[PDB]
Design a protein around this nucleic acid. Structure first.
Lengths: 95, 60, 73, 143
RNA sequence: GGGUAAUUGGCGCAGUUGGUUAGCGCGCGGGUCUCAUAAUCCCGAGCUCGUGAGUUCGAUCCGCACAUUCCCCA
RNA sequence: AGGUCUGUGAUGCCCUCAGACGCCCUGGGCCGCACGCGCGCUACACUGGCGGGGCCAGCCGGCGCCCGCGAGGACGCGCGGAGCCCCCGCCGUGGCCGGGACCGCGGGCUGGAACGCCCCCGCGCACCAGGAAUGUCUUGUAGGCGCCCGCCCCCACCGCG
């Protein structure tokens, strides 16, 4: 249950892409399909755990669990939530 | 302000900007049944349930 | 940079580490290393003592990692 | 093992052969900090001396410390072979010994002198600092 | 001498008893060379003293440099 | 007017032809090193290193006994397969037991001949994931792991598989 809750709360709901041309970024805000959302949530979980356990004494598994719990709690201490928020803001800025 | 979740009922092709976006028609199953058009990234299919942060934007 | 000992200097073992751990529900070698700033080996030895005594119990075991549960509550 | 608490005689940092040694490391890897002693030669020396090897060097009572010295100046008597030594078939006396700190630096200096006056290929090369073995120069090995 | 105003981060500028404040600018990053974009991090006796207040760039007062106008029997 | 007259009893026209550019012998060199860059290999560690044990391939394929720490060696016959991985322990974020270049004594193999290749003790270099710039890839694929043949007296970080 915790894992599904995390994969839900992690995953963007909006993103920016280049379509407006005009010789510049001209990025346009768009929406995001569910499959991409789950894929990105998983990727972010794994990546955040990986970055912590490197050259640190603690093991990979504890980092994994911590990331999962924090993301499921909706807390922004985690890496996943932070990336989600980042993307959402750079998007809404471009909407 | 509060995001709402819309359903897909028709996909009407990609764009020429590297072919990543796909135009999509959606309907507010919340009760309004408004059939509009948006721009979506990633693989989509009929009966998917998009989530929208705007109740008043368009595309074309 | 940081250094940690490998051998407890006498009263240190009981005046804290034993006390501290006994007030923990779950534990591992590495957590306790990072918590009271001692090397991992000493953690291994101590936890051996404790499972012998009976306060803690094993829930999962393996060469790379084992984790305990506080059976004293 | 099963040594949790520092013994009453724990010695936090050991000095020996002018080098200093810490008492948190296991014994056979601390001695490697001496110049002339490695992993293989140490396990062999201690064992002959009836010393535990999986012990922290701070619990090394001086009684066990002295017998260890007695075995690094006359090791051949104590059963250790001769293919395990640093210096086999010395150029002068033709004997075999093990050379520790201080001895190595002096010994290394005198060979080059021997090489120099004798007028060899290696000696002339050492003094402009080139490769002695046949490993190729030219390619790579540049700033 | 008399009156008026002002001195802030490396930069001019708004801010005045509870943000060290906005832009400029520091370099590392992302964004088809990667800049105009955006993200992030950094830059301080706020000219100098005292006064009361939970708490003054911040309210009064001391003195110095700068600018405008005005005054003059050793 | 891409490369190959240096693969050939494939060749036109030139040059060399008895102090020979023919052929055979002895040595040296093709490897030399202030410097710029092209394909590769090894690592920067805990999703790990060391020690012990258990276990399965394919192109295909050879073994016993006795010495020696080992690499190797003397005899004698026809017979035959691994790394990663899994289990138990040690180390405990320290340029440290990560990494293994350089150098100093010593033991052997090939060969007419070591400058070549293997093993043992000691010493223990750079390196903390890499700027402007750039390459390859869609299922048993990338990547990781090892094993065979070719050239070969000896030798594979190469190449075909």
């Amino acid at each position: 249950q915790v894992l599904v809750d995390a994969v839900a709360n992690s995953g963007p709901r909006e993103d920016s892409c280049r379509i407006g041309k005009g010789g510049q970024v001209r990025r346009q805000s768009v929406d995001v399909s569910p499959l991409r959302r789950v894929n990105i949530g998983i990727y972010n979980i794994a990546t955040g755990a990986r970055k912590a356990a490197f050259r640190k004494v603690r093991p990979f598994a504890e980092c994994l669990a911590e990331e999962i719990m924090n993301a499921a709690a909706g807390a922004d201490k985690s890496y996943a939530i932070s990336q989600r928020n980042s993307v959402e803001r750079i998007a809404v800025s471009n909407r | 302000p509060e995001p709402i979740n819309a359903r897909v009922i028709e996909v009407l092709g990609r764009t020429s900007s590297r072919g990543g976006i796909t135009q999509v028609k959606v309907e507010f199953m919340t009760g309004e049944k408004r059939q509009i058009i948006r721009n979506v990234i990633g693989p989509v299919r009929k009966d998917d349930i998009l989530v929208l942060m705007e109740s008043e934007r368009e595309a074309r | 940079k940081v250094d940690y000992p490998t051998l407890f200097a006498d009263e240190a073992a009981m005046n804290e580490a034993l006390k501290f751990i006994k007030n923990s529900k779950c534990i591992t070698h590495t957590q306790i290393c990072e918590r009271l700033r001692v090397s991992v080996a000493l953690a291994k030895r101590v936890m051996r003592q404790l499972v012998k005594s009976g306060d803690f119990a094993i829930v999962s075991k393996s060469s790379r990692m084992t984790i305990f549960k506080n059976m004293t509550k | 093992m099963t040594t949790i608490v520092q013994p009453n005689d724990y010695r936090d940092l050991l000095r020996m052969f002018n080098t200093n040694i810490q008492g948190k490391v296991v014994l056979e890897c601390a001695l490697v900090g001496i110049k002339g002693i490695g992993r293989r030669f140490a396990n062999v020396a201690l064992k002959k001396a009836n010393i535990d090897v999986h012990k922290r060097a701070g619990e090394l009572t001086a009684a066990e410390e002295d017998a260890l010295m007695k075995v690094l100046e006359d090791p051949l008597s104590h059963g250790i072979p001769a293919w395990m030594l640093n210096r086999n078939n010395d150029f002068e006396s033709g004997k075999d010994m093990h050379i520790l700190v201080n001895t190595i630096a002096s010994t290394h200096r005198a060979d080059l002198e021997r090489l120099r006056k004798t007028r060899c290929e290696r000696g002339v090369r050492h003094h402009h600092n080139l490769k002695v073995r046949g490993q190729h120069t030219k390619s790579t090995g540049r700033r």
